[PDB]
Amino acid sequence: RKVLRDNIQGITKPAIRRLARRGGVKRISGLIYEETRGVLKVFLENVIRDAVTYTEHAKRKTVTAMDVVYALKRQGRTLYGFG
């Protein structure tokens, strides 16, 4: 079994810049990158925990697309395109 560590630093600076440009931001400060990594980690924990609850309820090991879609729907973030 593998154990992965320090992966939040995998979301690099240019990726966050790309996200911001899509959002419409013109100038980005220098301390936004760590803050964005933090926000991303928090959202991801909140969604993956519900997805894993839905999975291990049905006696499974394979987090399905629909488990994630339900984990999102139960946060008011309906996601059309994977059901």
Binding site: G24, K26, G76, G81
Partner: protein, 106 residues
């Protein structure tokens, strides 16, 4: 044997929607008109979204409706954007929009 969809003048399935109601645990018994009515509204909303999406795809000289066109046609409609309020669309991008205070002044 005629399909109820044909009798009611629709395209969406009245039989399948009625069954889906009966086995979804919505009430103990389900009236005949509820299936027809629900199917009519479903088909109307589908017609609205698909019409606007086809328009938005023709405004790009593209003869095929892709997710991007559905997003463009839903965010550019007040009522539909109110209906898709909390909804994300995969592969949908965002609307081209730049705030005024960011453009070069001169």
């Amino acid at each position: 044997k005629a399909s109820r969809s044909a009798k009611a003048g629709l395209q969406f399935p009245v039989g399948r929607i009625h069954r889906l109601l009966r086995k979804g645990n919505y009430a103990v018994r389900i009236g005949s008109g509820s299936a027809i009515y629900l199917a009519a509204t479903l088909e109307y909303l589908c017609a609205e979204v698909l019409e606007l999406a086809g328009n938005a795809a023709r405004d790009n000289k593209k003869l095929r409706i892709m997710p991007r066109h559905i997003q463009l046609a839903v965010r550019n409609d007040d009522e539909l954007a109110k209906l898709f309020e909390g909804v994300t669309i995969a592969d949908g991008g965002v609307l081209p929009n730049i705030q005024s205070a960011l453009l070069p002044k001169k």
